[PDB]
RNA sequence: ACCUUAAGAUAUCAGAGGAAAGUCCUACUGAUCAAACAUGCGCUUCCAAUAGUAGAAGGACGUUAAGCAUUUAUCAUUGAACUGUUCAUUGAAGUCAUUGAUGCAAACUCCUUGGUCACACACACAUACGGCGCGGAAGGCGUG
RNA sequence: UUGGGGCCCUUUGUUUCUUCUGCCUGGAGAAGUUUGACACCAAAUUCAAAUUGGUGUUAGGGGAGCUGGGGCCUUUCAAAAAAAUUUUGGAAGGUCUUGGUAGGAACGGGUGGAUCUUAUAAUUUUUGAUUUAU
């Protein structure tokens, strides 16, 4: 899939993601896995009713994520181009 | 090997 | 050391430590009893199951609790 | 806008979609990739009807005017579990002929660059 | 210039939610029972559609199943070539359909003496079904001829490939 | 089978740290830096302008604009415009990368300096700094350097001025400073 | 017998797979729906959204989604003391299998 | 036996898809993905009014129906005429097929018949 | 398939919000590929009553698993 | 230093032939389907003043603006007066906002977008309106 | 070749296909055009040059040939309703138009990617806990 690989390419940059409970989170993205589990660092959380707090790290299960907002520059990623050249993988 | 259920089988079966 | 949850449930089964199972909300009940056996999918059979609303509930006997509802299994 | 009858989600690449979620929120952005059907939207702005103005949509001035709170958020990947249904709103910036032209352009350039890359990496 | 280019968007503004809380989310509870319908509405439904529409797509399924259960017992249903024991007699297989008994006898006599020849043909039509029984004057010669005709890519059949072996009777 | 699209090296199918090892090396750490420098460089260099719809001017609109005057156009040679474009791009880069840190140098001897400006002992983003410089420790007390003015510090740097307008400056200062 | 039934679905062969599917449809919980289709007796299906349908099954499937005809949707909408009984008749209907709760066979 | 294969056989016929929200989509039905991801073209979304005074209606359904962008401002009821709405598979509750089609010719699973003949 | 990356949270106090309302704090002991977690010395944050010596949480009802330590 | 792999398939039915029952195949043959490419329909919708200083579509995360109307700003303990009300004290949490939020409405300013094409400055039309200039955009349908 | 009229030059790096020469009393000159050239980015040797690694650009219009397609006309041939008439099929020629013009065919595999089926209706996406309910 392309979106999972894009989220993989989005490592090390500040992303903002909103869960299905209503909360919002933004901060450095340390690691992501193929099942949309993400680990944010220095996250600034907004609980559903509006209160805002701060934690060092967080590990949110991917089954609850609604959407993930990556930096806009990733639109020029090499894996978004359709016609691609492959190095003829060895035997 | 398909869904994690098979992997959990190949743990629980040995556990029992 | 690391103990997997499957090993923890196995320890519960072996030592017969009574457990209080938290069924998730909008059901508003808890199950208290001893684990006799578990499955792949967190399906558990319970002996001497006790029904407790969220303490005037009625005993149920031996039941098989489907694992899609379990949320916690605490002793 | 009119869209071809035989047009799956693969044909609507760079069309500006109208994606609807389970919780009554819509997303309005250009589709650029998909997969579980979890999209990638370029400049999608999320809209919603506030609970204070929801009562005006209920059956009964003559013409309704709903102020919809909208947030701006860019290059966001959705999750297919929440998506409810998608609608099309606008055509891409480029015409079909120009699209084919740029595809042929990039194919020619890529073939030439691949040939040169092989020629360099072998010798 | 390491991360001067990946400048993120400003933090997203806050809007009061318009959906139900994660704790209050549920499907329909208090789903009423099904027993009450059986007493009243079922009688009316049965009275107003007496009989249901025929189940027609199962017809083809059971029809092709009938072919399977019809082919087998019919093939099993059953009970010139009653010569002596095959110790000295030779047998051939996969011969031509339009072949004859005299041609088969000559072909068998090309590599061994023949004492009695009688080709068994299908009962449907008077065409050689590809089986020819040839009695040989020497069992060793017959076995050698059969081995040669089996190892040499099959004996020369008119419109087929005729491999040879023991009569297996 | 998954390959990096920056390194172009075809990588034997991995999913664990093998992908966290490739992406954390150097041939995939600076070769992903050169890529996005070029892509962002393009969007800075783009000069394509909007499509031009030219309408037929009418007589009332033409007569007034024809009355006034013709205006001379300034034009440069090829080498001169090459040099000017290079200079302008360099100036834009230099100004864009410029960061003002006068407040950091001004409070160099503040009583709580090491806890705020050092940026390694801060409480918000210090968790990141906490194989690879005489760093300023947090245990500094105000007793050190009781009198800052004892020849330790230096004068504030004079304000910068635009070089293309460097003849604008007054010729002589008011007072005679040695 | 027991080994093949308990055997994980990724190691049986293709032929034994559709044999298992046929055995599940013949001797199993869906044998009820299979019988209800075969002898053409109506079924009373109780959906997840408090809708009861009375219909005759014409084809069912593993996920318990069936095609029905002569459907008669019966449901009630209430608030406080007031209640209203509404019914709707549908000629031919497809039904998804994730909604059903209990499927009752007519006596 | 997979009924998605039977559903793929309609491909040009008028259906009435009733989602799980309550909104019922009426329109010509194009191809159906093997996950039941329907694609209808000349659609007319509508929302049934529960006919009961105090029971008002679904609200999230009204929000989605209006945010589709095709709702008529002067419409008395909640209908939104638009073209080509793509419906995710898991949202469909029940599909009211047309009355006129024949079920006996479409329900015959060719793949299952082939498997039965092969066995 | 792929074990979640929680090898750095071992034996460190974490606070994870069960479902959408409950919040449980404890010392993590292990985890599974479903993100099931076994945490000892739990305490249901709300006064707050402890749960037990050894509890397991089904990974379906976990939403976030932020850590209250150095990490 | 860690890593070396889910397996299958590539239009479909019907008919003739070849290697009892399938089984496979046919630069075989019909019918259906799908894709590409040509090619058409009196097909359908849309394509901006200069005879003028305009206008259409979509924005503004724009101003007037503290606009005009409503509505909000903790909980427990103890003492004192008081017929619930007021003052002080200890503890507990506590998104910022009150020039906010919410409801209503209007003016103004500005951005992006377009054939700012050619011939015309014209008395039409009941079968209601030559859809009988060249292009472009988007679909519908047909043929090869 | 020279002059006149109209319109355009925001073509803003003054035609934007590239380099070099050059321009407002002007719209110009030379060389070049894909296994090549040109522009730009990044580094470190302790300025520049050097190299290695990258991202792009190589265009727009018109014509001759050569060629794919349609419409219409002529001739010739075959079948049916015949050497007179028509319709159907094919060959050749004419006219008008519309498109292309550097790759294409055949074979091949421990070749990439799409689609489809099965594992797979058992906690991480599609076989239901978001119609707010009693």
UniProtKB/Swiss-Prot annotation, chain A:
Molecular function GO labels: mRNA binding; RNA binding
Principal subcellular localization: cytoplasm
Cellular component, GO, one term: U2 snRNP
Q: Where in the cell is it found?
A: Cytoplasm, Cytosol; Nucleus
Domain Sm: start-end pairs: 2-74
Query: How is this protein organized at the quaternary level?
Result: Component of the Sm core complex, present in spliceosomal snRNP U1, U2, U4/U6 and U5. The core complex contains SMB1, SMD1, SMD2, SMD3, SME1, SMX3 and SMX2 (Sm proteins B, D1, D2, D3, E, F and G, respectively), and is probably a heptameric ring structure. SMD3 specifically interacts with SMB1.
**Name of this protein:** Small nuclear ribonucleoprotein Sm D3
Gene name on record? SMD3
Swiss-Prot record, chain B:
Tell me where in or outside the cell this protein is found: Nucleus
Disulfide pairings? none
What family, per the record?
Belongs to the Luc7 family.
Other observations noted: Present with 2270 molecules/cell in log phase SD medium.
The protein's job, in short, is: Component of the U1 snRNP particle, which recognizes and binds the 5'-splice site of pre-mRNA. Together with other non-snRNP factors, U1 snRNP forms the spliceosomal commitment complex, that targets pre-mRNA to the splicing pathway.
How does the record describe its quaternary structure?
Component of the 18S U1 snRNP particle, a subcomplex of the spliceosome.
Q: What is this protein called?
A: Protein LUC7
Organism in which the protein naturally occurs: Saccharomyces cerevisiae (strain ATCC 204508 / S288c) (Baker's yeast)
Gene label: LUC7
User: What stretch of the whole protein does this chain cover?
Assistant: 4 to 19 of 261
UniProtKB/Swiss-Prot annotation, chain C:
Broad class of where this protein is predominantly found: cytoplasm
Q: Which Pfam families match?
A: LSM
Q: What positions does the domain Sm occupy?
A: 6-75
Give the keywords, sorted: Cytoplasm, mRNA processing, mRNA splicing, Nucleus, Ribonucleoprotein, RNA-binding, Spliceosome
| One GO BP annotation of this record | mRNA splicing, via spliceosome
**Positions in coiled-coil regions:** none
Q: Which GO terms describe its molecular function?
A: RNA binding; splicing factor binding
InterPro entries this protein is in?
LSM_dom_sf (IPR010920), Sm (IPR047575), Sm_dom_euk/arc (IPR001163), snRNP-E (IPR027078)
Does the entry feature the keyword Cytoplasm, yes or no?
yes
Q: Name a GO CC annotation attached to this entry.
A: nucleus
Q: Where in the cell is it found?
A: Cytoplasm; Nucleus
Fetch the SMART domains from UniProt.
Sm
Describe its function.
Involved in pre-mRNA splicing. Binds and is required for the stability of snRNA U1, U2, U4 and U5 which contain a highly conserved structural motif called the Sm binding site. Involved in cap modification.
Q: Give the record's subunit note.
A: Component of the Sm core complex, present in spliceosomal snRNP U1, U2, U4/U6 and U5. The core complex contains SMB1, SMD1, SMD2, SMD3, SME1, SMX3 and SMX2 (Sm proteins B, D1, D2, D3, E, F and G, respectively), and is probably a heptameric ring structure. SME1 specifically interacts with SMX2 and SMX3. Component of the U4/U6-U5 tri-snRNP complex composed of the U4, U6 and U5 snRNAs and at least PRP3, PRP4, PRP6, PRP8, PRP18, PRP31, PRP38, SNU13, SNU23, SNU66, SNU114, SPP381, SMB1, SMD1, SMD2, SMD3, SMX2, SMX3, LSM2, LSM3, LSM4, LSM5, LSM6, LSM7, LSM8, BRR2 and DIB1.
Q: Which family does it belong to?
A: Belongs to the snRNP Sm proteins family.
Any additional notes? Present with 556 molecules/cell in log phase SD medium.
Protein name listed in UniProt: Small nuclear ribonucleoprotein E
Curated annotation (Swiss-Prot), chain E:
Example GO biological process:
mRNA splicing, via spliceosome
Record keywords, A-Z = mRNA processing, mRNA splicing, Nucleus, Ribonucleoprotein, RNA-binding, Spliceosome
Which positions fall inside the RRM domain?
Answer: 88-169
- Tell me which domain of life the UniProt entry assigns to the organism this sequence originates from: Eukaryota
Its subcellular locations are: Nucleus
Which purpose does this protein serve, as stated in its record?
Answer: Involved in nuclear mRNA splicing.
Subunit description: Component of the spliceosome, where it is associated with snRNP U1. Binds stem loop I of U1 snRNA. Interacts with mRNA.
Further comment? Present with 736 molecules/cell in log phase SD medium.
Know the name of this protein?
U1 small nuclear ribonucleoprotein 70 kDa homolog
Which residues of the whole protein are included? 11 to 188 of 300
């Amino acid at each position: 899939g392309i979106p999972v690989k894009l989220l993989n390419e989005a490592q090390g940059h500040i992303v903002s993601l909103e869960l299905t409970t209503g909360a919002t989170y933004r901060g450095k993205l340390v690691e992501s896995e193929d099942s949309m589990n993400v680990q944010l660092r220095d996250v600034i959380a907004t609980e559903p009713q509006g209160a805002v707090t701060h934690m060092d790290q967080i590990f949110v299960r991917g089954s609850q994520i609604k959407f993930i907002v990556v930096p806009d520059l990733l639109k020029n990623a090499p894996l978004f181009k359709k016609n691609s050249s492959r190095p003829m993988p060895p035997i | 090997m398909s869904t994690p259920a098979a992997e959990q089988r190949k743990l629980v079966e040995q556990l029992m | 050391a690391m103990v997997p949850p499957i090993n923890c449930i196995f320890n519960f089964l072996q030592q017969q430590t009574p457990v209080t199972i938290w069924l998730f909300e909008q059901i508003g009940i808890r199950i208290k009893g001893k684990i006799v056996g578990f499955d792949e999918f967190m399906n558990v059979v319970i002996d001497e199951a006790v029904e407790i609303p969220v303490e005037k509930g009625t005993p149920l006997g031996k039941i098989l609790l489907k694992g899609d509802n379990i949320t916690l299994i605490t002793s | 806008i009119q869209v071809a009858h035989s047009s799956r989600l693969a044909n609507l690449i760079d069309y500006k979609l109208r994606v609807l979620t389970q919780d009554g929120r819509v997303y309005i952005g250009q589709l650029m990739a998909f997969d579980h059907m979890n999209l990638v939207l370029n400049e999608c702005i999320e809209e919603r009807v506030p609970k204070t103005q929801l009562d005006k949509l209920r059956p009964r001035g003559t013409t309704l005017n709903i102020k919809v709170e909208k947030r701006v958020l860019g290059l966001t990947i959705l999750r297919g579990e929440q998506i409810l249904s998608t609608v099309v709103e606008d055509k891409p910036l480029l015409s079909k002929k120009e699209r084919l032209v740029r595809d042929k352009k990039e194919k020619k350039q890529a073939q030439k660059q691949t040939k040169l890359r092989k020629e360099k990496e072998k010798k | 210039d390491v991360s001067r280019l990946f400048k993120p968007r400003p933090p997203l503004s806050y809007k009061r939610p318009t959906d139900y809380p994660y704790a209050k989310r549920q499907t329909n509870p208090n789903i009423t029972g099904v027993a009450n319908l059986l007493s009243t509405s079922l009688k009316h439904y049965m009275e107003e559609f007496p009989e249901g529409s025929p189940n027609n797509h199962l017809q083809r399924y059971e029809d092709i199943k009938l072919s399977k259960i019809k082919n087998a017992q019919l093939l099993d249903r059953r009970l010139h070539i009653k010569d002596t024991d095959p110790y000295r007699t030779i047998f051939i297989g996969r011969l031509p359909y339009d072949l004859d008994e005299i041609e088969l006898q000559k072909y068998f006599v090309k590599f061994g003496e023949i004492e009695k020849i009688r080709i068994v043909k299908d009962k449907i039509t008077q065409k050689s079904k590809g089986y020819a029984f040839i009695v040989f004057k020497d069992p060793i010669s017959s076995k050698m001829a059969f081995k040669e005709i089996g190892v040499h890519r099959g004996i020369q059949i008119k419109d087929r490939i005729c491999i040879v072996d023991i009569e297996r009777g | 089978k998954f390959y990096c699209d920056y390194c172009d090296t075809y990588l034997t199918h991995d999913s664990p740290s093998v992908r966290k090892t490739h992406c954390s090396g150097r041939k995939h750490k600076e070769n992903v830096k050169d890529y996005y420098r070029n892509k962002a460089r393009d969007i800075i260099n783009k000069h394509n302008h909007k499509r031009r719809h030219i309408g037929k001017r009418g007589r009332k609109e033409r007569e007034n604009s024809s009355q006034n005057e013709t205006l001379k156009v300034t034009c440069l040679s090829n080498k001169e415009k090459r040099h000017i474009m290079h200079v302008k791009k360099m100036n834009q880069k230099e100004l864009a990368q410029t960061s003002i840190d006068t407040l950091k140098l001004l409070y160099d001897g503040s009583p709580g300096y090491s806890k705020v400006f050092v940026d390694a002992n801060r409480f918000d983003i210090g968790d990141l700094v906490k194989r690879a410089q005489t760093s300023r420790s947090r245990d500094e007390t105000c007793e050190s350097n009781p009198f800052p003015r004892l020849n330790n510090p230096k004068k504030l740097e004079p304000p910068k001025i635009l070089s293309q307008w460097s003849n604008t400056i007054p010729k002589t200062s008011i007072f005679y400073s040695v | 017998s027991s080994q093949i039934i308990d055997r994980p679905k990724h190691e049986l062969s293709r032929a034994e797979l559709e044999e298992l599917e046929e055995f599940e449809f013949k001797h199993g919980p869906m044998s009820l729906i299979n019988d209800a289709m075969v002898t053409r007796t109506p079924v009373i299906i109780s959906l997840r959204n408090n809708h009861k349908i009375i219909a005759r099954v014409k084809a069912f499937d593993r996920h318990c989604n069936m095609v029905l005809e002569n459907v008669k949707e019966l449901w009630t909408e209430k608030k406080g003391k007031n209640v209203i009984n509404r019914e709707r008749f549908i000629s031919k209907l497809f039904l998804r299998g994730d909604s059903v709760i209990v499927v009752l066979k007519t006596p | 036996m997979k009924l998605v294969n039977f559903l793929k056989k309609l491909r040009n016929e008028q259906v009435t898809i009733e989602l799980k929200n309550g909104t019922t989509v009426w329109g010509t039905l194009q191809s159906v993905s093997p996950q039941m991801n329907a694609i209808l073209t000349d659609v007319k979304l509508t929302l049934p009014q529960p006919r009961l005074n105090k029971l008002n209606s679904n609200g999230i359904a009204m929000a989605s129906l209006y945010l589709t962008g095709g709702q008529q401002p002067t419409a008395s009821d909640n209908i939104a005429s638009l073209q080509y709405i793509n419906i995710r598979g898991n949202t469909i509750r029940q599909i009211i097929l047309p009355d006129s089609l024949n079920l006996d010719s479409l329900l015959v699973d060719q793949k299952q018949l082939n498997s039965l003949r092969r066995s | 398939v792929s074990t979640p990356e929680l090898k750095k949270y071992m034996d460190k106090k974490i606070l994870l919000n069960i479902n959408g309302s409950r919040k449980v704090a404890g010392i993590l002991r292990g985890y599974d590929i479903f993100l099931n977690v076994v945490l000892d010395d739990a305490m249901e944050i709300n006064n707050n009553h402890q749960l037990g010596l050894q509890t397991v949480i089904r990974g379906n009802s976990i939403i976030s698993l932020e850590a209250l330590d150095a990490i």
